[PDB]
């Protein structure tokens, strides 16, 4: 979506998509990261079912 | 849109309220179970001849 | 709105983060250099 | 098991517009009530899609 | 009953059953019902002392 508006802006398809992406880097760990160790608890324990 | 709860927070932290509130008197009247029940419904039939 | 007001470990947080959102860019321009290859290790 | 796969996305709408906010306020010098109210009008349609 | 021999029970029928099951339903009730309204009011008013 931002790459998409990087283009409505006129920038170049390369550079608007690695704009886009810098941009939006840090928020994709962020919400990765918070799927990936709010499930570590699953794994780890042990115990009835 | 969220112009109207931005100018009014009273009005959106009462929807939060009455959605805490309707959830905690839902959770003590759940059923519990260990997972869903998938038997087919049996009806039996006992005969004795000694 | 109502709560949020104007604004050791974080400061090397931040300074990393900001040093690896520089490499991610130009990591990310060389790879997008190189686009078969990885259409076909994408296959 | 729902709820608790479900945490991390429901957790990742109120990190996203709190960190518009974050964002927009830092960037661009503005009350923090009016810049709440620019950050939800910029991103207003993605949250829905 | 209590002290009456051992190995008599009682039991309550009618009414009087239904009257125990519902022993304190009508004033939770009515804390819920105030609640509602206080929210709904504060809602209305835009402040929670009005
Ligand atoms: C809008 C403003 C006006 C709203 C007025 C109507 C509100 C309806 C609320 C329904 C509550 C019904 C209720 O309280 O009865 C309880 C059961 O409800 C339940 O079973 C829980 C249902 C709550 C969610 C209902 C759906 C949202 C509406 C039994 O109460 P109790 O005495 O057995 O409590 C046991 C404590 N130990």
Known sequence: ?49 | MSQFFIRRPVFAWVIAIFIIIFGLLSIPKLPIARFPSVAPPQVNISATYP | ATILKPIGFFAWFDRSFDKVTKKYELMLLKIIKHTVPMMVIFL | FGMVLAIGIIVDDAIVVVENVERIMATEGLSPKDATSKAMKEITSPIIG | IAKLPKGIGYEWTGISLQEKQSESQMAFLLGLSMLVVFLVLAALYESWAI
């Not at chain 1, 979506?1 to 170049?12: N, V």
């Not at chain 1, 690695?18 to 918070?34: C, F, G, H």
């Open chain 1, 1 to 49: 979506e931002f790459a998409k508006m990087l283009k409505e802006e006129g920038m170049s398809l390369i550079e608007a998509t690695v704009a886009a992406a810098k941009l939006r880097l840090r928020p994709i760990l962020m919400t990765s990261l918070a799927f990936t160790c709010g499930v570590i608890p699953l794994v780890i324990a042990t115990g009835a079912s």
